[PDB]
Amino acid sequence: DCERPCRGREFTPPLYDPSEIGGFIPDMGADVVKGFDVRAVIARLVDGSEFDEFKKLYGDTLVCGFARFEGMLVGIVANNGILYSESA
């Protein structure tokens, strides 16, 4: 049934409703595509909207951090603009 019987299901749902994620998503098909903060998406997907950012001031266009989905620890890498050498 399970290699380890540990459950670890003491998680908290996201603090923001996912139903408004589309509010932050601009029109991808456009002459000039607007930019948005991907963290607003992350806040509506992870447990308790908690997110430990890895290098908050270095990449600045690639958001890397730790989060949890129903108690499962996951590393999140998200695009937040043009990739640079520092972001890569």
Binding site: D31, V32, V33, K34, G35, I82
Partner: protein, 666 residues
């Protein structure tokens, strides 16, 4: 005979009606909005109907929606309680029109007694005593002086449109009248643009005395003695007593007869109340206002023995609504020992009695029932874990204690309030204890302004001895500790707990050994607490057995939240607020300079200034949009302050080009 009764008002009144319906085998139907997933009255009812959106204003007030709810659930009667929509004649008329039976007075009587003008005319025409005041159209100074002489000093002068106590002048002697009248007229003109004035008799020591009447559908009526509501602040009842102390039997008979006559004159059906302004010096009562509904203070009356059985006012109201004759007529009613009711609200008396919200994180109720010498009854609409929302039913609960004498009832109320442990919401338990222990209150009947008279004495701060601080710190540390052992080799483990006492950040430094012995340090003081054992109660609390110093053994109960620590010691109940956490912990808003001369990231075109020139912008706030490679890049403010742009919009910038200045405006 009713089979289903729908209660249109939430709160503890709904629970009371549900309980009395369960006693009478009537199915209960509740009313709620979409934002009430765990309301107590919803859980205590057989069925519930949602009224629509939850703004707490449209719901519980839509009469048509309530009628539809009652018709859909086959409700037989509609009981509005004493909350909102319980005094609207249109709602009662709609209830009667749909075929449902309204539990209350006829709509005509309810409408006639809500205007404050026609009600006075009816009361005058009935022979009921009225306040000896003059309100005629003649504003001639000589006529006003003659009317003041007829009324008898002292007198009070009010504006016709005056409200909130403005434009009222107290006249004690005839000489001062010529000046006070002119001053009142000037103030009325400056505030209401109406020089017309009203002269009434001023009562120096008023007492709001309420007589409760109950009338059948056949015209019979019976009074239910008296209720005293003198102890109040800004038209908010606080503490009530029954019967009113210092009232003779003849006076009570006279008041009851007057109340019955007034109710007969108005043609009342159901349970109603009449409030008079009684004067201790003059020993004469004058009609003030009648309420054509049940009242929150009705339990103190129920603690009246109809033919020996205790009174159930809601049961009688339901029986009358069904259309049944009264059992007896002022013969099987007997007075009993005095009962006292305290209204536990959710406000802070120290800070001007302003309502405050919160969540009832711990709600240990006092022992309710028939105690050794007194009977305790608690009525509440909240359970543990519920969150009380501010500006919506601020009353947390009402606690009534019945004894044989007023002193015994007061002692029982003090004991019950001492046992009412509430953690999560600020309350007025300390204020109620101060009021109960006040010598003036315990002497006997007091004036209405008593709260305003002893404000300095009643608002006295509660002292917190160092023992309470030490025990709270120890309880907090024990809550932090799990099964881990406290061990640092050749050292005592050091810990610190920060509380807020009167805005002062008090810090308790504790040294704990491996033998579970804490030593807490205060200014020139040391408290040693040895924790013998702990036990986690099912109500998220902990029972701790301690030995304070080396000679004071006792057990207590502790409740630890993320914001406060509560201890139930033999000395009483204490809640100490932890020092609040900063909201800007580790705040790095890309800069901290007062100028914030930011440079462009790359060559591009500035498209739009998202903030006007000279506008205040916070940290991380967008000020302009930069477009390069057909991609919108938004420049954000790095600090708070007024932003002034340097480059014009719809232009072009280069690498590391200055864009705007963020100057911290004073």
């Amino acid at each position: 005979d009713f089979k289903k009764v729908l209660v249109a008002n939430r709160g503890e009144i709904a629970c009371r009606v549900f309980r009395t319906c369960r006693e009478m085998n009537i199915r209960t139907v509740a009313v709620c909005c979409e934002g009430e997933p765990n309301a107590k009255h919803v859980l205590e009812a057989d069925e519930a109907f949602v009224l629509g959106p939850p703004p707490a204003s449209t719901s519980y007030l839509r009469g048509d929606r309530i009628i539809c709810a009652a018709k859909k659930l086959q409700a037989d009667a509609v009981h509005p309680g004493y909350g909102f929509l319980s005094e609207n004649a249109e709602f009662a008329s709609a209830v009667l029109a749909a075929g449902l039976k309204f539990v209350g007075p006829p709509p005509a009587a309810m409408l006639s007694m809500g205007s404050k003008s026609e009600s006075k005319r009816i009361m005058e025409a009935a022979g009921v005593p009225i306040v000896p005041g003059y309100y005629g159209e003649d504003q001639n100074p000589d006529r006003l002086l003659h009317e003041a002489k007829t009324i008898g000093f002292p007198v009070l002068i009010k504006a016709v449109s005056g409200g909130g106590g403005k434009g009222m002048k107290i006249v004690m002697e005839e000489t001062e009248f010529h000046l006070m009248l002119e001053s009142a007229k000037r103030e009325a003109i400056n505030f209401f643009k109406d020089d017309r004035v009203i002269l009434e008799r001023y009562v120096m020591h008023p007492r709001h005395i309420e007589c409760q009447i109950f009338f059948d559908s056949f015209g019979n009526g019976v009074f239910f003695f008296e209720r005293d509501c003198s102890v109040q602040r800004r038209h908010q009842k606080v503490i009530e007593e029954a019967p009113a102390p210092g009232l003779s039997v003849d006076m009570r008979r006279r008041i009851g007869d007057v109340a019955l006559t007034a109710a007969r004159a108005v043609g009342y059906v159901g349970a109603g109340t009449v409030e008079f302004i009684f004067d201790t010096e003059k020993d004469e009562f004058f009609f003030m206002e009648m309420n054509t509904r049940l009242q929150v203070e009705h339990p103190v009356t129920e603690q009246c023995q109809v033919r020996g059985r205790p009174l159930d006012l809601v049961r009688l109201q339901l029986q009358t609504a069904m259309g049944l004759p009264l059992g007896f007529r002022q013969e099987d009613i007997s007075m009993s020992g005095a009962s006292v009711e305290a209204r536990i609200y959710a406000e802070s008396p120290r800070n001007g009695f302003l309502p405050v919200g919160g969540r009832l994180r711990y709600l240990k109720e006092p022992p309710q029932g028939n105690r050794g010498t007194v009977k305790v009854r608690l009525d509440t609409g909240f359970r543990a874990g519920d969150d009380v929302l501010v500006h919506y039913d601020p009353m947390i609960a009402k606690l009534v204690v019945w004894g044989d004498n007023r002193a015994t009832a007061l002692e029982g109320l003090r004991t019950a309030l001492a046992s009412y442990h509430i953690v999560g919401v600020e309350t007025n338990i300390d204020f109620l204890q101060c009021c109960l222990s006040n010598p003036g209150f315990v002497e006997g009947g007091v004036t209405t302004r008593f709260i305003e008279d002893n404000s300095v004495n009643l608002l006295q701060p509660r002292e917190i001895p160092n023992n309470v601080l030490a025990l709270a710190a120890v309880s907090y540390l024990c809550s932090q500790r799990g099964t881990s052992t406290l061990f640092w080799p050749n050292r005592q483990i050091s810990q610190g707990v920060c509380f807020t006492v009167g805005g002062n950040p008090v810090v308790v430094r504790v040294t704990v050994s491996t033998k579970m012995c804490f030593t807490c340090d205060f200014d020139s003081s040391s408290v040693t607490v040895y924790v013998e054992s702990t036990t986690n109660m099912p109500d998220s609390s902990t029972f701790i057995r301690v030995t304070v110093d080396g000679e004071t053994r006792f057990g207590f109960t502790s409740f630890v939240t993320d914001s406060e620590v509560a201890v139930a010691l033999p000395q009483g109940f204490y809640t100490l607020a932890l020092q609040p956490l900063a909201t800007d912990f580790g705040s790095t808003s890309a800069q901290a300079n007062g100028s914030a001369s930011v440079l462009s990231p790359m060559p591009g075109k500035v498209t739009k200034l998202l903030v006007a020139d000279g506008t205040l912008v916070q940290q991380g706030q967008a000020i302009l949009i930069l477009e390069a490679m057909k991609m919108e890049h938004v420049v954000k403010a790095s600090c708070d302050g007024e932003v002034k742009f340097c480059v014009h919009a719809d232009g072009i910038v280069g690498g590391s080009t200055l864009l705007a200045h963020i100057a911290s405006a004073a």
